[PDB]
Design an enzyme around this catalytic site. Structure first.
Site, PDB file in Angstrom:
ATOM      1  N   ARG A   7       0.614  -1.036   0.443  1.00  7.35           N
ATOM      2  CA  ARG A   7       0.324   0.225   0.287  1.00  7.35           C
ATOM      3  C   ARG A   7       0.690   1.095  -0.391  1.00  7.35           C
ATOM      4  NH1 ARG A   7      -5.166   1.906   3.908  1.00  7.35           N
ATOM      5  NH2 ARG A   7      -4.996   3.838   3.216  1.00  7.35           N
ATOM      6  N   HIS A   8       1.008   2.217  -0.808  1.00  8.95           N
ATOM      7  CA  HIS A   8       1.823   3.377  -0.927  1.00  8.95           C
ATOM      8  C   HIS A   8       1.954   4.325   0.189  1.00  8.95           C
ATOM      9  CE1 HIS A   8      -2.055   5.987  -1.091  1.00  8.95           C
ATOM     10  NE2 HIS A   8      -2.474   5.165  -1.907  1.00  8.95           N
ATOM     11  N   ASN A  14      -5.171  10.735   2.734  1.00 15.75           N
ATOM     12  CA  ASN A  14      -5.208   9.837   3.758  1.00 15.75           C
ATOM     13  C   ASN A  14      -5.225  10.140   5.227  1.00 15.75           C
ATOM     14  OD1 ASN A  14      -2.826   8.373   1.456  1.00 15.75           O
ATOM     15  ND2 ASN A  14      -4.940   7.863   2.383  1.00 15.75           N
ATOM     16  N   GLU A  74      -5.961   1.943  -7.747  1.00 14.27           N
ATOM     17  CA  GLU A  74      -7.345   2.417  -7.280  1.00 14.27           C
ATOM     18  C   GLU A  74      -8.502   2.102  -7.462  1.00 14.27           C
ATOM     19  OE1 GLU A  74      -7.515   2.899  -2.712  1.00 14.27           O
ATOM     20  OE2 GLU A  74      -9.637   1.834  -3.702  1.00 14.27           O
ATOM     21  N   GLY A 134      -5.154   1.031  -0.872  1.00 15.28           N
ATOM     22  CA  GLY A 134      -5.623   0.934   0.303  1.00 15.28           C
ATOM     23  C   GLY A 134      -6.168   0.079  -0.792  1.00 15.28           C
TER      24      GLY A 134
END
Length: 171
Positions: A7-8, A14, A74, A134
């Site tokens: 996950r970046h 975020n 995503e 995510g």
């Protein structure tokens, strides 16, 4: 087949709690720090990455030169892109929480998202590291029957399409 999904690192949305899909946000300073911590913690395997900035940059700081694939993107939130989770309508929050039946206007349906992601995974010919998002990690984990939430900048190794091998979180 051994696959490492990453996950970046974090972006401003975020931290702010806004739905982040195809909006091409950059990593924050902390996000870059998280990406650097991954270097050396991930195996030396072929790499693939979502073509979105935050994913590519995470792969770069983690020491990889990934082949880009939009299929690793995503989910596309459409008109809901940027919406605060807090203010998300009940039927939408639950839809996202249960990960079933969701199709925002101008975006992708969860079903189309899953098909896209799983078709990509099925096509992999050998173990690899996948820099992604995510929602992608959650789709994969949920399909394997587990909680799909992992910290930004963390990784999960799985034996696709059978089981989760390990969840790697660094501090």
């Amino acid at each position: 087949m051994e696959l490492w999904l990453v996950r970046h690192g974090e972006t401003l949305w975020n931290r702010e709690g806004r739905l982040l899909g195809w909006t091409d946000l950059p990593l924050t300073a902390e996000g870059e720090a998280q990406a650097r911590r991954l270097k050396g913690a991930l195996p030396s395997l072929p790499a693939f990455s979502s073509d979105l900035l935050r994913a590519r940059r995470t792969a770069e700081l983690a020491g990889f030169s990934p082949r880009l694939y939009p299929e690793l993107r995503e989910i596309h939130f459409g008109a809901m892109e940027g919406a605060l989770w807090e203010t998300l309508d009940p039927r939408y929050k639950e839809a996202l929480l249960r990960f079933q039946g969701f199709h925002p206007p101008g975006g992708e349906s969860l079903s189309a998202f899953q098909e896209r992601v799983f078709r990509f995974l099925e096509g992999l010919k050998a173990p690899a590291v996948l820099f992604t998002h995510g929602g992608v990690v959650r789709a994969v984990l949920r399909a394997l029957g587990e909680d799909g939430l992992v910290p930004p900048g963390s990784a999960v190794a799985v034996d696709w399409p059978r089981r989760v091998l390990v969840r790697l979180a660094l501090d």
